[PDB]
Amino acid sequence: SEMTPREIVSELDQHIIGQADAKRAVAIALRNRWRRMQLQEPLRHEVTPKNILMIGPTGVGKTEIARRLAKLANAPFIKVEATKFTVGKEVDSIIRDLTDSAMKLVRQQEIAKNRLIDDEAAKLINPEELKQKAIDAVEQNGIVFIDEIDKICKKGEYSGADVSREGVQRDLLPLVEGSTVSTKHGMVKTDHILFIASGAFQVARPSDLIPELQGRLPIRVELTALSAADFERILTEPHASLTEQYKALMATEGVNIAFTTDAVKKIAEAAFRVNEKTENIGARRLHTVMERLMDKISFSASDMNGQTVNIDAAYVADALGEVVENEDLSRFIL
Amino acid sequence: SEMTPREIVSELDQHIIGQADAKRAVAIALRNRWRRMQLQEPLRHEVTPKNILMIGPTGVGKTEIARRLAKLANAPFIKVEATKFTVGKEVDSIIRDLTDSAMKLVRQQEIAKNRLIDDEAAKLINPEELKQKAIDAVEQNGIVFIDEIDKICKKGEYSGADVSREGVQRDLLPLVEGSTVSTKHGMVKTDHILFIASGAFQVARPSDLIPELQGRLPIRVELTALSAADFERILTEPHASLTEQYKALMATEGVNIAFTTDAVKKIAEAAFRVNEKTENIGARRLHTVMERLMDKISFSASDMNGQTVNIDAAYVADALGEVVENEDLSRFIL
Amino acid sequence: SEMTPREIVSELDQHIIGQADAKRAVAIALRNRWRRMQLQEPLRHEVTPKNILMIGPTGVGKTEIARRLAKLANAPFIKVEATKFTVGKEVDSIIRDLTDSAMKLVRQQEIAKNRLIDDEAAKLINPEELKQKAIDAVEQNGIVFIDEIDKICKKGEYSGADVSREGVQRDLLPLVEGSTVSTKHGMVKTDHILFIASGAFQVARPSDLIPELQGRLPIRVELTALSAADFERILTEPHASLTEQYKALMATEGVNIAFTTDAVKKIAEAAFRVNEKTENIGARRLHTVMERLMDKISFSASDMNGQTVNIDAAYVADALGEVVENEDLSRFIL
Amino acid sequence: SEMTPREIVSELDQHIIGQADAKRAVAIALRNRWRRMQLQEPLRHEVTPKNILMIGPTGVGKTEIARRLAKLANAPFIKVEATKFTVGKEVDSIIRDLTDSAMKLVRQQEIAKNRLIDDEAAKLINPEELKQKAIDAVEQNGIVFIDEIDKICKKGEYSGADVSREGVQRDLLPLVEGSTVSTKHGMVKTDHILFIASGAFQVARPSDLIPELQGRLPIRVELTALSAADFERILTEPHASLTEQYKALMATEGVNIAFTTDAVKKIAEAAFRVNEKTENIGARRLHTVMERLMDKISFSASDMNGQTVNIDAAYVADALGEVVENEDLSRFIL
Amino acid sequence: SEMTPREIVSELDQHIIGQADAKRAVAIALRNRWRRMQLQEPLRHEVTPKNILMIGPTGVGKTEIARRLAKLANAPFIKVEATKFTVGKEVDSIIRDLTDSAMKLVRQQEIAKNRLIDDEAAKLINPEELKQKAIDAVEQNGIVFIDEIDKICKKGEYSGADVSREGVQRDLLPLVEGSTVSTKHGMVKTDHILFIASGAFQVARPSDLIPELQGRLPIRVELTALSAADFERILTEPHASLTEQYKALMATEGVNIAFTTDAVKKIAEAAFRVNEKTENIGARRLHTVMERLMDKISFSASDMNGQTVNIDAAYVADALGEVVENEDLSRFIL
Amino acid sequence: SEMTPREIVSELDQHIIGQADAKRAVAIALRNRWRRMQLQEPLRHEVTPKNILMIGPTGVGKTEIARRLAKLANAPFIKVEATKFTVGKEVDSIIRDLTDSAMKLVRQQEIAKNRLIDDEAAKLINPEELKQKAIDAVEQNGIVFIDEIDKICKKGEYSGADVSREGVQRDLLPLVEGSTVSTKHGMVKTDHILFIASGAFQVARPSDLIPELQGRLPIRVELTALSAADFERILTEPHASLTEQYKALMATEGVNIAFTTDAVKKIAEAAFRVNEKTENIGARRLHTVMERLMDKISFSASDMNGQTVNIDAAYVADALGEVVENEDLSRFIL
Numbered sequence A, B, C, D, E, F: 001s002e003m004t005p006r007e008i009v010s011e012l013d014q015h016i017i018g019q020a021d022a023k024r025a026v027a028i029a030l031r032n033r034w035r036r037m038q039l040q041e042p043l044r045h046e047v048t049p050k051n052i053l054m055i056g057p058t059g060v061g062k063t064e065i066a067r068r069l070a071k072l073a074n075a076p077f078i079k080v081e082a083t084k085f086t087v088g089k090e091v092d093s094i095i096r097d098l099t100d101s102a103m104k105l106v107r108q109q110e111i112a113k114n115r116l117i118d119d120e121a122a123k124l125i126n127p128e129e130l131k132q133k134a135i136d137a138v139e140q141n142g143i144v145f146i147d148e149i150d151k152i153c154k155k156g157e158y159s160g161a162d163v164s165r166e167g168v169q170r171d172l173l174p175l176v177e178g179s180t181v182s183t184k185h186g187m188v189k190t191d192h193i194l195f196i197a198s199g200a201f202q203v204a205r206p207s208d209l210i211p212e213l214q215g216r217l218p219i220r221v222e223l224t225a226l227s228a229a230d231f232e233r234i235l236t237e238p239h240a241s242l243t244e245q246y247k248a249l250m251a252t253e254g255v256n257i258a259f260t261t262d263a264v265k266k267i268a269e270a271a272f273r274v275n276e277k278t279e280n281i282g283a284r285r286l287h288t289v290m291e292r293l294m295d296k297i298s299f300s301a302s303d304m305n306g307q308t309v310n311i312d313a314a315y316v317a318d319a320l321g322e323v324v325e326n327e328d329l330s331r332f333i334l
């Protein structure tokens, strides 16, 4: 898009708390596409996407940053899990699924951008028109998110699976290097598709990836663990935060809810407490804690039409009970 | 549907004895769909289904609650066994089978809702009409029941199958996270499909599921073991209970049967006795015990037209004989 | 059909010697279909087939009872071996093959039930007419015989194959529980298909089957070993018995044969003697013994037109020679 | 055919030396088809083919007897190796290949039996005409030869392959028991297809085959080893014997050859000598010995037009040299 | 093409630094095609391509020389990883993918070489016209690059994979020897396709390849390791070098950058330093170092419109910081 | 063809040096086809091809003799590697690929044998015309070369692969025995296809092949190792020898080269020296040595237009340097 790096980050800031480095890395990556378009031949086709490799713990915004990025750029997105390819599925599926994603994007945008009348829905839908467009979207703005790419790295005492793993990287090369893949909508060039690979790299390191693949993931960026304070912001700041979602849902029932300031600190404190006591699943822990919290009101909201319900610290401690501190309970409920 | 949580539970109560927590959890889940529909963009598409994970022993109503739920909501249902995916079958089959289920639902409802005349059965059946409808049903009201999801959790001394198991969870992610799957009726978005996963979690715990999947199963609910008293109610209270079924079947033969109060306690006592002496298969034990009980009358009902047969405690003890107390017999017969 | 349990058993008696319990179990099962049809909604669709599990030694009439049952009911039958499913074949094949079987049944019955003229064979054969009929036959009267279902039960020191075995039961569930399967003739509901599972259960017990599958095989019935006296009756009583078959075959050659009373006792005595001395293969042993007996006359019948040949005890002892008592010979010849 | 057992054996005698028992067994089997056709319903469809199991060493005429049998009966034949089925191929292929074989038989017989003119080759070739005919041939006269069926028998220390082997027998059951298989020419009933199974049964015995399969191979017959005297007859008596073939081939070159009486004894003596000194491959040994013998004359026959060449004992000893007695040479050359 | 060896090398020199031997080997190979075309039958079809085997370390120009070669010759190129073939993929895919590559080359060249007007894009696009052309391109000028062919060589303690590896070479033979492969565009002869195989041959040697394959890789050539001085030239001399690319990208932002002489020595010194301290990935190391260097300016270039930025030694040392010397950092960042 | 054995060998002599026995064996084999055609029914179809098994070291002319044979007979050829079949590929592929080969042969011969005019290329190309012809070529003159057939023989300590190997022979039987295979051009009878199997038989012997397959490879012939003197002749005598090829290639550049008598002895001496010092790859060694020799002149020929270059002993010793005697070098370069 015509958006500048800072404008892209400003947009990302409204959905993702923190992770400024990753926000900048993807902003740059998206801006480069615009820059390349301002170039002239023969340097235009020589310049390829600077794929990004995100390094960070689980549930801190890696995928979300990528999803959001694709959203604000109005581009075809696709998430895939690396280990998925170690019969089975062929990597080309990635580009295939991605072209489908591009179809919806093109369809809903075409038919909508041109308005009993159902029998006259065509008059714009040219079988070749849409196919070339979907292809065009994928070839020029396609974004592929490759999760757990650190799990296809040679682990310890190599050989056995470390032969199958590297085979996955190997099979990914044609895609990140620039290949032509066949899809039900025609051929697709992967040359300018932006690739975002992710991994925790707890044991494995990026230098463990086969060399041909390291060179195709030039941009290395780290995402940080989230703090209780971060959970606090996430709960209320991002567009469509959990508190805003629940507030809107109860409203359809005639119930007006409100979270006091400390009730939010309490919720975030609960999530962070379970992650550090058991397994840290990051921001995701916020989902179960909120559901546990909104359990009761969610079920009986229909019987409280016209009421305002204040969810304060007391309400939160009541709803959570002994769950947070008792692993026997938390490992089931949260 | 327009049904409120309490109305949904009231309906569930007429088919399932007990399990109030699970009945509430699914009621909420179904009501949320209605609520989301009352929202406005851009918060409407941001709100996703709060998938449910049922935790409980075998044969206590987990699936039945899900089946019934789909029934009362007039929605496409599909049951699948997790371990089924560890060539083989691809998870997308789930969404494929589910779209077929949606086809029948749409067909039988369309042709019926619009009435020699066989050659004029069309005049409503538009190849595109039904396909978009079936797709619409699945995308907006689809319900998937994933049984034994605790068997695809990393067991002990991980690795070997614990690599294949988690691969299943991994492959399930795109579905529970929101993917587009191709089906003979067109593309299908799984974004708003309600997922109900089930497991006994005797050894494994929900916290053992990969994190990306925990976050997509926010609602955790427990189902309880059933008591002899519960078996008692099940035998006669639910719509189409076993006693009501047998009574109606014998009636077609001209035989009027009746179960005395204690005969029912005796039947339920027998089932509960075998489950606690051998393997507890819950309510299912009621099927074999009833068949053993109705064996004789079922075969000769044709020769008793016009008779009323009272099945009392004595009749039950006679029909069961030594089966209940002799494992050598019970493990074959019941 | 409109046939009563006793009428069904009377018919079965003319093909199968003994096994009264199994004859009654299948009679009941077939009668239930008629009964369910006399019911009214919504109890009509709630009542499902009471599948049968036959427990008994090999070659005593399990399959034959099922084959015959399908015959007298004019219904689509299909036999399948359980272990067959442990790439490979998918259980849906069962329903697919079963629908084909239903096609022949419908075709031969339609074209025949409506009578140079070859070019006018149509005028009734409507591509949609037959397909809906075949589907209808399978959905309403389909019968599936699942042999060796005890071989897919967890054996000893479980795990290894006991994981693959139970997977088979698991994959069978959708069929016995009620699923929709796609076939070249359209979709097929397995909801009202009657399932008859068989097994010797020498080591494994029915209680070893996964619980979901036990509940779907409510009727447990035992078949007994056959005696020399039973072999005696089988040789001459059932319609199309072996003696009647051979008598009719030789007659086409102009040869009239007759078995004296003791010649039959001798034949049955021979079969029973080999089964108890080596491996008991039940009634099947009667096939080889009869062939050994009719060997000579069968070859030269063409040269004996106009003759009556009396097969007496002496003839039988001559034809059999030392085979019965010498395992070295019997294990090759019989 | 209308041929009697003795007429069938007389025909077989002109192609196969010895093996009177096997010749009689297949004659009977083929005659039974005719007999069954003389029967009336409902005994007609009840009578099934008496499949044959041939027991004997390699290269003594088992397959040849079956090939010839199919020839003289003008029926679709197909040879298959059992172990072939232990992805891979599905047994149904057998019936598929067999239907193709039936196509050629029907085509060449139809177009031929009805006579620039190439553009008028049709006027008889009705796409449905031939397909129903080919189907008819296979269903009524099809013959399947199953070689090495003793290799799919449970060997020693069962389990491992003895599980896969018996699976083959299991998968063969539907075919020998009577199934319907789909083929590019339509559905095919295997009910009346005659099956001839073969095996050396050196270690395994027929009683080792699963019981369901023993019963479907009622006729057991043994083929004997061949003697030097048998090799002697084979070399010159059967239609298209090796000597007759070579005599006709050299004649096209203008060379008249003749084998003296003792030259033939010498050739047969050589073959029998190598089989008993190394590995006995039966009659097949006659192929290599004849080729070694005719090597020289075969190459230079073109330069001997007009000559009569007498192949006598001296010629044979010359051509064979030291090959027969030197295993180092015989294992390469013969 | 009509280009002479020296003209081809002169062209290669503008993209690849060093590697004169490999540049000559491919120049010769490409010139031979022209020479063969000047020959007359029957010597014309007897002369086959002198395939090349490149021996050298990773990231020194093996693939690039091949890519460039295909470019300057306007020929269909395809890169493939040998181990990729050890279900899976069939080598024929190589020729299939290669024919697709040839399609784009032909299309873009045809429609372009012949010029509202969109509905009149045809008038040249003959379905058969393009297919025969694409086929023609592949058959006459096709170039296949087979990477890591030394990994399919029998390693140590042969057998296990050394059986699968050599199978790959075996399956490659038909292609390098001259085969006909089927593709969606028709049949394709691989007879005159130039094959370039590559490998590091650190342990394995060319003499380890199966003999049939050695003979089809007649030209053996070595590529050398690159020096810091080479990295220096690569950074600025080749067309579309990294410095030229970055200069052009920033220019679209209104930023004029310039690298001082020593800044370039510093960049090349950094890359060479990391390769010799950790893992030598050759020229590829230049990608990560440049990205690390241009990180800051790349993100904020939009805010520096109108500025000239001099990237000198100081700027480079600043941007790199401690990364180069700290393996803990370099293995993540570079 | 009408060619006599001696005429066929005379033709083979102009392409293959030595191997008189193998040349005679294939000449005979090809002549037999002609002879069989001179026969009358019913002996005509009884006579089958005398398949050949070639026994000899690698690179001595086995394949070449077969290729050439197919050439001079204008017949469809196909080379296949036995171990290729141990999912994977099915032997029928052999007959399929062979029918394609037959298509080209028929096409290029038909369209050529019958002559702006491009739009009038048809008027002879009848879709059925060519298909029946290609089929006819394969059925009557098809030649299949089966390399490494000694690698599918039971090795040592049989079982493991010796079960898979023999399975290959087993699957080959239907082809060599006479089967019907389906191909995109119609059905194909393999009855008269000539099969040439090859192997080094260093450890395994022909007597190790399963008996059914020995009998179908009646003609056993040995090929000898080649001497330095043989290499000498090969370099210059065969049509399209290496020296003749290089002479013609340089001529297109304006360069006239000539090899002195001793220069040729020197080249052949070099090849033979490397084969006996390292691994003997036979005549193939001549390819690398010639390329090493012609390296320099081949690259600069363009700059020597008008020159005569005499390649004498001195030139050869110069070009080869230390390669021949230094295994470290020879195993890379030659």
Ligand SMILES: Nc1ncnc2c1ncn2[C@@H]1O[C@H](COP(=O)(O)OP(=O)(O)O)[C@@H](O)[C@H]1O
Residues within 6 Å of the ligand: B015, B016, B017, B018, B019, B057, B058, B059, B060, B061, B062, B063, B064, B065, B234, B238, B282, B283, B284
């Ligand atoms: N609470 C209950 N109320 C009514 N019926 C029940 C209940 N629990 C079990 N059943 C009966 O027992 C069977 C149990 O299967 P299901 O409900 O799927 O549970 P589970 O998944 O634990 O086996 C069903 O056929 C149902 O009719």
